[PDB]
Nucleic acid binder design. Structure first.
Lengths: 181, 201
DNA sequence: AGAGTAAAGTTTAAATACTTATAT
DNA sequence: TATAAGTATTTAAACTTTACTCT
């Protein structure tokens, strides 16, 4: 019943963990990535920034990676590709084809109307609202497990879902609760 | 070993609570509530991961918010052994977990108006006009998302000008514990959206 | 005094891995 | 030990702080 005709979402960041299935000597790898930063002291992996797909990659000696910054699973598949490429190009052999897992997505969106957060926080379950520390209401959804930040302007940020289909389930739940009275 | 490690850690936490309440001159009922929350956090295993200093400082702030004692987080941070960032994380964390909801923790702007106005030596005429401006800003939808203390500071500032008992943006900022820029940002916004006329500054 | 500003900091989630403090 | 949290990376929302400049 709650008119949701104005609610919309935009993907903003996709995070995936990748298993290349092959040990790696991070010092020998530092070259394969121009724009790179390494300090085992602070962080155990290589911080690499691809230019084509505008993604950041984290490479670990264990052969596993993290790809963040992506706007599509496609951009991630491509990033895992360029890297796998450059790897064989220095003597690396893979026991299997790369295993890619989307671990988290972040969406921004708009509900299309404004809210008085003090009133919303009075009845919205599973929420926090602490304007002395952060401006939005923090709404925690058990399933699909995610978090939605709701601002007075009606804009929202949804994090933790593993797909847009799931994020929309989270938003639909929020919309339904915002409708009780 | 006639006292468990739990007992010794609780004694240390209670000494820290005693040090904070003496320093902030907090009433017995507040200190007692902070101690009760702390023991609940312990019972639920909420200390694992953060410092006892962090958690006790958050329990004192949570106790002030539950009992409507208008202290600012910064007063606590000033004497706590940890930073605002860390006390803020422990505080949101134990509030979430002890079921301290936004409703239970809510403290009306009016209570801060009186507290800050006391420290500023402002009259009941000013308090009244400020409470009046805050009520109007709330009706117009300008309050959500903003630091509540920031709004109180700016409404006191505006009202002190309007009632002839002027205080400086820096003065109100210092007692509300936000920056002058914040007071300034809320001041401008309140003045033009509520069409408020001001003598000078 | 105070107008004003740009950039940085604050929050949410996740996987990687390597450290440090502590519960039991 | 098995637990958590911190270190690093991304990303939007919108708010405050920082660090000044210019009146």
């Amino acid at each position: 019943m709650v008119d949701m005709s104005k609610v919309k979402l935009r993907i903003e960041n996709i995070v995936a963990s990748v298993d290349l299935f092959a040990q790696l000597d991070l010092e020998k790898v530092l070259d394969l990535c121009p724009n790179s930063k390494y300090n085992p002291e602070e962080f155990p992996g290589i911080i690499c920034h691809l230019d084509d797909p505008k993604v950041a990659l984290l490479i670990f000696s264990s052969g596993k990676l993290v790809v963040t910054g992506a706007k599509s699973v496609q951009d991630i598949e491509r990033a895992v590709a360029k890297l796998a490429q450059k790897l064989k190009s220095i003597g690396v052999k893979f026991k299997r084809a790369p295993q890619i897992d989307v671990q988290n997505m972040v969406f921004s969106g708009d509900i299309g109307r404004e809210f008085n957060l003090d009133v919303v926080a009075l009845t919205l379950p599973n929420c926090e609202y602490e304007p002395e520390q952060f401006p939005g209401v923090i709404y925690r959804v058990k399933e699909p497990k995610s978090v939605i930040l709701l601002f007075s302007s009606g804009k929202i940020v949804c994090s933790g879902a593993k797909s847009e289909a799931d994020a929309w389930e989270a938003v639909r739940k929020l919309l339904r609760e915002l409708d009780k009275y | 070993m006639v006292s468990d490690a739990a007992e010794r850690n609780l004694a240390f936490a209670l000494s820290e609570l005693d040090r904070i309440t003496a320093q902030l001159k907090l009433p017995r009922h507040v200190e007692e509530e902070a101690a009760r929350l702390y023991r609940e956090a312990v019972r639920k295993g909420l200390i694992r991961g953060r410092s006892i200093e962090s958690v006790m400082a958050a329990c004192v702030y949570a106790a002030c918010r539950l009992l409507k004692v208008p202290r600012t987080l910064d007063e606590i941070a000033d004497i706590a052994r940890v930073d605002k960032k860390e006390i803020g994380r422990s505080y949101r964390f134990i509030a979430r977990n002890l079921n301290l909801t936004p409703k239970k923790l809510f403290v009306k702007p009016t209570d801060y108006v009186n507290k800050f106005a006391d420290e500023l030596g402002l009259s009941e005429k000013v308090r009244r006009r400020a409470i009046e401006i805050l009520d109007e800003a709330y009706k117009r939808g300008l309050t959500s998302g903003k630091s509540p203390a920031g709004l109180v500071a700016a409404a006191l500032y505006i009202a002190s000008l309007l009632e002839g008992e002027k205080r400086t943006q820096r003065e109100v900022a210092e007692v509300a514990r936000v920056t002058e820029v914040t007071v300034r940002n809320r001041y401008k916004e309140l003045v033009e959206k509520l069409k408020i006329k001001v003598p000078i500054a």
